[PDB]
Amino acid sequence: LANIKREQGNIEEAVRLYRKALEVFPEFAAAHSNLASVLQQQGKLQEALMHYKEAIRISPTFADAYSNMGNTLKEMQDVQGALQCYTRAIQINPAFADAHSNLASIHKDSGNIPEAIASYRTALKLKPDFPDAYCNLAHCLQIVCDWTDYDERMKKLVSIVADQLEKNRLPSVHPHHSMLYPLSHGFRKAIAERHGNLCLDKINVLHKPPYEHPKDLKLSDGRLRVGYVSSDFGNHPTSHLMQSIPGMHNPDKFEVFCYALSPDDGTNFRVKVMAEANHFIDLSQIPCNGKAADRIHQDGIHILVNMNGYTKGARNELFALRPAPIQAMWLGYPGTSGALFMDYIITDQETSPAEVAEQYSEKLAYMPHTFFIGDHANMFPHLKKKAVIDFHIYDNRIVLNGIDLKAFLDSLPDVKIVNMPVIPMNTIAEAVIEMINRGQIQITINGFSISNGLATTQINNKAATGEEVPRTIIVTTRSQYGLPEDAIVYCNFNQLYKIDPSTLQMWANILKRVPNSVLWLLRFPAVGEPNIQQYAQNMGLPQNRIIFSPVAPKEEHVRRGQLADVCLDTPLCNGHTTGMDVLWAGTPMVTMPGETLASRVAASQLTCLGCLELIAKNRQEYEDIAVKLGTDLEYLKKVRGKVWKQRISSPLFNTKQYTMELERLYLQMWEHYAAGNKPDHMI
Amino acid sequence: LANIKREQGNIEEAVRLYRKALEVFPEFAAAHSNLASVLQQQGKLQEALMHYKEAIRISPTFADAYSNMGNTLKEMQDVQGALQCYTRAIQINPAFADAHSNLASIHKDSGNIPEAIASYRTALKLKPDFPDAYCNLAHCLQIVCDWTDYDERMKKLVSIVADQLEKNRLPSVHPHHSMLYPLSHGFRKAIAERHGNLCLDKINVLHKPPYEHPKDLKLSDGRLRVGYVSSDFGNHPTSHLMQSIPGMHNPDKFEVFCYALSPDDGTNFRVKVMAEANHFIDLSQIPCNGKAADRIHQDGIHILVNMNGYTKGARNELFALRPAPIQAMWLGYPGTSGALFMDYIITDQETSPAEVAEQYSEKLAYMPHTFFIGDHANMFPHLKKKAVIDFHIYDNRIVLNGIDLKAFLDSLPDVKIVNMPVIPMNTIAEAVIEMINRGQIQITINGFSISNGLATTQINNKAATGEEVPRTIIVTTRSQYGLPEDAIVYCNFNQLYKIDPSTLQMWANILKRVPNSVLWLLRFPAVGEPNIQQYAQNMGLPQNRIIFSPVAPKEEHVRRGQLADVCLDTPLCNGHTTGMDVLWAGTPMVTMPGETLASRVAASQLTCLGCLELIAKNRQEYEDIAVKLGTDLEYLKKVRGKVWKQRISSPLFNTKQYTMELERLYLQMWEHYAAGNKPDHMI
Amino acid sequence: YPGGSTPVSSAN
Amino acid sequence: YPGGSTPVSSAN
Ligand SMILES: O=c1ccn([C@@H]2O[C@H](COP(=O)(O)OP(=O)(O)O)[C@@H](O)[C@H]2O)c(=O)[nH]1
Ligand SMILES: O=c1ccn([C@@H]2O[C@H](COP(=O)(O)OP(=O)(O)O)[C@@H](O)[C@H]2O)c(=O)[nH]1
Ligand SMILES: *[C@@H]1O[C@H](CO)[C@@H](O)[C@H](O)[C@H]1NC(=O)/C=C/CCl
Ligand SMILES: *[C@@H]1O[C@H](CO)[C@@H](O)[C@H](O)[C@H]1NC(=O)/C=C/CCl
Structure with missing residues (x-):
């Protein structure tokens, strides 16, 4: 019934009528397929799948049924099945835009972003007015820092959302992604309200009474x-x-x-x-x-x-x-x-x-x-204290951390205190440097085990994920990451999607002011790296000024932030969990709080920590803060010492308080x- | 050391020398990368991964290290990680053939055969003499019944294997695939010997003594x-x-x-x-x-x-x-x-x-x-007996099976016996037919439950996989699969890769002799279907003569073979498990035993069953057997009755014997x- | 099968 | 991370 199709919103009603359509005419492919699509909206996945298959039995070349079946399969987590259906839909009709877009989203989910990009483009070629496809493409381009036609894209996104919100439709920009795009607060709020509305609608169809709630204790x-x-x-x-x-x-x-x-x-x-x-x-x-x-x-x-x-x-x-x-x-x-x-x-x-x-x-x-x-404090207590090796004195070139670090230090003929223990270049210090240069997993000094920070999953895979505290002394060094011994390291450890052209421009400005310095980024994902590097070079910065590392296991990631001098927060969406990670390592973070909650979390962390001098009111300030911490070395030492002591004395990491x-x-x-x-x- | 690289075969020796190369020169990307590749051959995956990452740290654009890293990731079952590495290798060097071929194999593993085909073609464009890529492409084309340039392909495969076996290299044709290609027995045996050799070589490097074995009981x-x-x-x-x-x-x-x-x-x-x-x-x-x-x-x-x-x-x-x-x-x-x-x-x-x-x-x-x-006999005892509905009398149009079938039958006013119980068209019979036409899940007749054979995973998901015997009476019908009520059903339920151009030609011949008949095949995988259908049409057969169904859950697959008249075995590689499946349903299988073990199993099954009249000595016989069983209806009834009774009386399904x-x-x-x-x- | 998986024999 | 997985916050 063309009717049931129309009952848009009255789900059980549509269902009951498609059933009746099949009571009149059993052999009705379209009714099977539509019945399946609504059973799927109700979460009856096995029943949905059965009627899609019935639909295809009647009409073996029903492209649309295969493409909708693939969605159902994807909800059931039969991902290969889903692929088979989408691919089949595209074989039958190579101009079916939705099928191409469904396929692209399978690729995006597996992190194959270039293959997802290419399939969303095919969908857009075939159907230029396709919001869900454009918005998903926009998220893929975001993830890999592909900024081709960036400003048009943003306006194109705002417009789609404007069109949609007027027309009462659920928008094609996901509320979680909405913070990345220059939408108004009213738009963001309204996107969120829509998703909240769909939750009421799915539960309204069970016509439950209100619950009555306790009023005393x-x-x-x-x-x-x-x-x-x-x-x-x-x-x-x-x-x-x-x-x-x-x-x-x-x-x-x-x-x-x-x-x-x-x-x-x-x-x-x-x-x-x-x-x-x-x-x-x-x-x-x-x-x-x-x-x-x-x-x-x-x-x-x-x-x-x-x-x-x-x-x-x-x-x-x-x-x-x-x-x-x-x-x-x-x-x-x-x-x-x-x-x-x-x-x-x-x-x-x-x-x-x-x-x-x-x-x-x-x-x-x-x-x-x-x-x-x-x-x-509970997951990484081995990071509460550290020691250095001196190869005059750096806090962040060759680092040791360990529950038993103090007793190791006490077994050494000579150690000086500056509080920070320093190990001088003796046999011990060279045995360490040698272990690292060779990529060896660990050595024994005076009965203690000394571990290569790169090899934690081989020594204790539960310590690597943060599920256990490490039981060896771990060594972390700038040469493990190709970072320079003789220059400022600025870091940012967030997923690349948090960066936008303005942010990379600010960083570029900072690196040009601070000739003796590198920006330390992660392959998060690796396919974002040549984009960032390309954009940096068009901003007039040599190949070697931006250093990439792979994503690390949780404990190595937090331990390695000790090697940086300063973290440059992303003003688009800040480090949240990753802001706590960097601060726990004692590394100052420079931030510029924006308008959204997501743009403001790092400034809240830093306020709780008592480092208000790290919060910028605008771009010029952010640059100046960052240049200041990479050139005024005594003020860097002060700010670092302030971070190192306040991660403990402040409320920030105090779970009981x-x-x-x-x-x-x-x-x-x-x-x-x-x-x-x-x-x-x-x- | 260019040396260590050369120690081809002396694995621990190569290892020990790459280590020494890094003792002389720590900062040596190529040595890290090669050391990783050999650690990976020894199965030290985490250590391998560490040195690949070291290699990339020194040389951020080392394509070859990323592509080898991806292999390691794939062994560790980090499939997305693997993809990221291959893709990165291809971004750095879009003409890197091996990286494209590595990517293709990731696609093949996820059953995305068209994307695998396209990437193996790119690899072949870039490096036309690439055996592993050609042979893997050949397997993909096989899986989807893509027979473009079929005869050249076969000769091209034989030649590669000839080249390789001479040169002592491990061949690019997998021994399990070797049965599909017209290689000599000496070639097949020698391919297998090579894979067996690599097992000795991996264990020889642990220099174990022989074990000494018990000599009495x-x-x-x-x-x-x-x-x-x-x-x-x-x-x-x-x-x-x-x-x-x-x-x-x-x-x-x-x-x-x-x-x-x-x-x-x-x-x-x-x-x-x-x-x-x-x-x-x-x-x-x-x-x-x-x-x-x-x-x-x-x-x-x-x-x-x-x-x-x-x-x-x-x-x-x-x-x-x-x-x-x-x-x-x-x-x-x-x-x-x-x-x-x-x-x-x-x-x-x-x-x-x-x-x-x-x-x-x-x-x-x-x-x-x-x-x-x-x-x-143990998994599917509900298939030992069946009943039919009569809508004069067919054994394979509307079927009921169930542990409690006999007591259901006894609750009915009228049932005749021909042994085969028949239910006449009364209210009961129409209630059943109606349940099916509507896609309803089940009904109750006289207190018994009567289940739609299509809905088994909704009723009892353990019964669907064969882990439990079903506890309801299940109804199976030709209209559930779009099969004709008034014509011969020939079936084959094997993966499509078992079919070759000669086999489809034989089937085509049989369907032209038997105008009132269809061939029933499965989407195994669905992307093979338009190929088969295309090839059938170029052989001069209309669209509707070949009917496809989806792959079913184990129990439905075995139950539904009861709907066929005759199964046409694949002479290239026969039904093995699937030959037992079809015979248990009482369906005669026509086969032509070849030379290989894999081409001969169905004839062995049928000999054990006592049906020697089903075994063909050549193609002409196979056709004639099959045409005979689709036209001599009394001889079809005899042969079917012989299969139905001997699945029990013969040794075939007798696990104790x-x-x-x-x-x-x-x-x-x-x-x-x-x-x-x-x-x-x-x- | 669509909905789950049909294990089969295949190469190592 | 290469070798396992780094869970992150992401959309439903
Ligand atoms: O090399 C790394 C970099 C990050 N992380 C972790 O990866 C997650 C990133 O998650 P998300 O993007 O949601 O972080 P947020 O947005 O909260 O900063 C965080 O738990 C980090 O601790 C990691 O384990 N290894
Ligand atoms: O619709 C189907 C068709 C086949 N099968 C099962 O799928 C497997 C196919 O495996 P393989 O190709 O190794 O079978 P063989 O080569 O032994 O015949 C067998 O267990 C069949 O029982 C299934 O469960 N549903
Ligand atoms: C797959 O399954 C059964 C049980 O493991 C085995 O007996 C049967 O021989 C096998 N079939 C094939 O391997 C077909 C191979 C052609 Cl590549
Ligand atoms: C991911 O992880 C933590 C804990 O669940 C949460 O506090 C943090 O806010 C979140 N980060 C983001 O969601 C970034 C979103 C931009 Cl799409």
């Missing part, structure tokens, strides 16, 4: 029940940030429930949150959103915490159901939900100043310092509701 | 210790064939040891072999070949059984070590090892007649009927050795 013996919901209890940045928090919650006043949206990945991160939460519930076992929300309700949750927003593995359908009376966005998602069902965003003054409450659909709930936290403040804010939110008020700003 | 209380070694104790054809065999071994005379080369995949196949073997050992935990062979030795194995040959997951290094005195190829590998370390091939008279003992490097050890066995014969042959082999003779032919 009595059923819970006076404890606030907090539920943390996340697809990232496992080897993920989220756990690298907050894995200690559940177990530090005061059990006299709080009862902690962790709701995992992902199965157990076997890592110590998942182990720790499982062991330390009062309750751990694996919602990855309970795929129906109604049941899962029911569980949440019957646990008696007072505050449910959304750690995903619009990131991989989200199930915001559960928050749409309102299983709890207070619902707050917490740390995994650097932006607004736009969704009426989220009451608060846990943030801070520096990140989200009360001026810009309008960027956000939620009420602002402030932590007193930064809302950012890091598990560095963080948890206690968080608790104080949960209670403020609770009391303001217990007394029948509705969500308002907490300060 | 005394340490084992009079029991022959048999070790079955396989990467396929899990959801694999091998387990679908032999999973019952270990537990049926006579524990008074045999002690069974299963050596898994793969981790536990969670399936009931793995569960059953684990539970029923006297001992189960997970060699996937013990990656070093020396240790694993040691374990085998200290278990006291008298006969070690190689179930892999040259198939995925093989570790023939363990057989090269000779941990046991008798070593036999058994069922997973349809050809010779060519390897001096394998004593026997368990085969039979029909498959491997004593005339052709020369095809084989091993001695022939004969099972008395076929060496082929199938677990069908098979195991007892196997035991009788193990003892013949043992006694002939106990008495210090060396391997000779057993009959």
Whole structure:
């Protein structure tokens, strides 16, 4: 029925009519195919797949059915199956734009960005007005720092979003990507609101009543029940940030429930949150959103915490159901939900100043310092102290770190203190330098093991990922990364997609002011590297001024930031987890806070750390800060010493203090509701 | 050192010298890269990866290091990493042929055969004399039934192999693929011998002594210790064939040891072999070949059984070590090892007649009927009996099967017997036909559940894979597959790569003789379908004479063979597992045994079954057999009835009898050795 | 098969 | 990272 096709929005209604169309005429390919497409929207993947196959049985060359089948296969995680279907659709009709675009997205998912780019271009050739394809292409070009026609692209993106938002359609720019593009705050917020709307619509079709919520603390013996919901209890940045928090919650006043949206990945991160939460519930076992929300309700949750927003593995359908009376966005998602069902965003003054409450659909709930936290002190305590070898004295050329470093140092005939232990060039120092020059894995000095920082996965693969603290003394050096012994190292360790033409221009300016210096970047992904290098050269900078390294295992990545002098933050979207990483190594970060939450996190970190001289108000300042730290060597020593001492003395990496403040804010939110008020700003 | 590079074959020696080259000159990219390449040949993947990264650190645009790194990444199963490296190599040098060929093989592995084809062509454009690339291209073209320039290709393949075998190099045609190409038996055997040689060379470098082997049965209380070694104790054809065999071994005379080369995949196949073997050992935990062979030795194995040959997951290094005195190829590998370390091939008279003992490097050890066995009786007992609906009487249009079929039939007012129960067209019969026409999942008749054969994974996903017997009555019909109600169905359910131009020509001839008939093929893979259809049309056959279906779940695949009249076997390489599948459904198979073991298995199955009238001596016979079974309807009924009754009464699917014969042959082999003779032919 | 996987025999 | 995987934050 051309009817059922039209019931756009009334899903179960469309379903019931396609069924009837097949009651009149069983042999109806198009009705099978459409029935499959709507069963797929309802998440009935096996049933969908069955009707697509029926559709193809009737019409063996039905391109559109194969291309839609491939989507279903991709949801079922049969990726090769998906490929087979898309390819088949393109064989049947080589001018089918959607099939080419579906294929491209398979390539993007496997990180084959050049093959994705080429297929999105074919789709665009065939159908020049194709928003989803243009916007996805734009994300691929972003990922690899392909800035061909950059300014047109940005305007072209803004326009598509304008067109779409007017027409009430869900926009082709993903809310998580929306921070990279010069959209208005109203646009960003509205993109987010749309995605939040689709969550209501998927759950409205189960016609559940509202849940009724607890109003006292009595059923819970006076404890606030907090539920943390996340697809990232496992080897993920989220756990690298907050894995200690559940177990530090005061059990006299709080009862902690962790709701995992992902199965157990076997890592110590998942182990720790499982062991330390009062309750751990694996919602990855309970795929129906109604049941899962029911569980949440019957646990008696007072505050449910959304750690995903619009990131991989989200199930915001559960928050749409309102299983709890207070619902707050917490740390995994650097932006607004736009969704009426989220009451608060846990943030801070520096990140989200009360001026810009309008960027956000939620009420602002402030932590007193930064809302950012890091598990560095617990994951990487071997980085609390370091020693150097002297080959007059550099803090960042040849570094040793280790739980047992002090006793190693004490076994040495001569060591001086400047506090920083220095090892002079004796046999020991040459044995070390030799191990590194040879690429050898480790040596023994005085019974201690001395490890090559490059070989951590061979010595202890759990120490490499940060799931265990290393039990050897590790040596880290500038020559392991081809970095110069005799010049300033500026670093940035973020994915390349965070860089834009203005940012690379600022860096270029800084490197021209500081002739004796290099910028240290990562292959994140390696296919972005010749673009950056090409753009740098057209800005008039020689080949050797930008040094690339590969992405490293978690512990090596954090340990190696000790080799840099200064980190240059990306103003487009800052280091978040990666800002904590660089600061834990004692390396100052220069930043320029923007308008969005994502552009402002590093300034919040640095404010919490007590380094306000590192925050720029504009581009000229950012350059001047950075040139100053690469030329005024005594002021570099001061600022470095300030970072090294405040990573410990400040609140920044203090998970216990963080948890206690968080608790104080949960209670403020609770009391303001217990007394029948509705969500308002907490300060 | 240009030296170390030259130590071709003396692996640890090359290693030790590259190390020394780095002792003289630490900063030597090429030496890092070569050192990595040899560490990789020794299986030291993490160490290899470290030195590749060192090589790239010194020379950021070292294309060759990136391309070799990608291979290492691919061995570590970091597939995206591998892609990144190959792509990077091609960005740096777009004329690097090997990098393009490495990329193509990544595409082939993911089943993206058109993208693999295109990249192997680029490699061939850049380097026209590139054997590995040409031969891999040839396999891709095979897989999709791309027969462009077919005859030249075959001669081009033979020549490459001739060139290579002379020059002592390991050939670019994989021994498992060698059966598809018109090579001589001496060529095939020699290809296999080469791969067997590389296994000795990898284990020779551990300079182990010979093992010394038991000579009596005394340490084992009079029991022959048999070790079955396989990467396929899990959801694999091998387990679908032999999973019952270990537990049926006579524990008074045999002690069974299963050596898994793969981790536990969670399936009931793995569960059953684990539970029923006297001992189960997970060699996937013990990656070093020396240790694993040691374990085998200290278990006291008298006969070690190689179930892999040259198939995925093989570790023939363990057989090269000779941990046991008798070593036999058994069922997973349809050809010779060519390897001096394998004593026997368990085969039979029909498959491997004593005339052709020369095809084989091993001695022939004969099972008395076929060496082929199938677990069908145990996996699919619901297929032992069936009923039909009559909409005068067909056995293969509308079929019901079920453990509880008999009691369902007994609840019906009218049923006639012809033995075959027939259901007449009443309400019941229309309720069934209606369920199917609507694509509905199931209905209840008289309290029994009646399931749509298309919806098995929705009802019971373990029944669909064959890990459980279905607990409902399943309905299977020709209209579920678009097959004609009023004409002969010829089927072949093998992967398309088994078909060649001569085979499709024979089928075409048969379909022209039998106007009222269709050939039923599978999308295996779907990208092969328009080729077959194109070639059929150039042979003068309309669009509708060849019907494609998708690959089905294991149980549906075996159940649906009941809908065919006749199966047309592929003479190039026959149905093996798939021949057992089709016979279990009661469907006669027409075959033409060739020269190779792989071309002869179906004739052995059919001889064991007692259907000699189905075996053709040449092409004319094969056509005539097949036309005869599609036109002489009374003789089709006879031959079908003969297949249906002999799948039970003959040895073919009789796992207990098979195991007892196997035991009788193990003892013949043992006694002939106990008495210090060396391997000779057993009959 | 579309929806999961059909393991088969193939080269090492 | 080359050799395994570096999980990151990314869109749903
Ligand atoms: O060489 C590296 C560079 C980064 N990282 C980690 O990679 C992740 C990058 O994630 P994301 O892009 O989401 O970081 P954010 O945006 O939070 O800074 C972080 O956990 C880093 O700690 C790593 O393990 N090795
Ligand atoms: O639609 C199908 C067709 C085949 N098969 C199974 O797929 C495998 C094909 O494997 P292979 O090509 O090695 O079979 P062989 O060469 O032994 O006949 C066999 O287990 C078949 O039972 C399946 O499950 N569904
Ligand atoms: C990725 O990882 C951490 C923890 O989940 C989160 O705090 C951080 O905000 C996030 N970074 C980004 O999402 C960058 C987005 C630009 Cl598309
Ligand atoms: C695949 O599966 C079964 C069990 O492992 C084995 O008996 C059968 O011989 C095999 N079929 C083929 O290998 C076809 C090869 C042509 Cl490359």
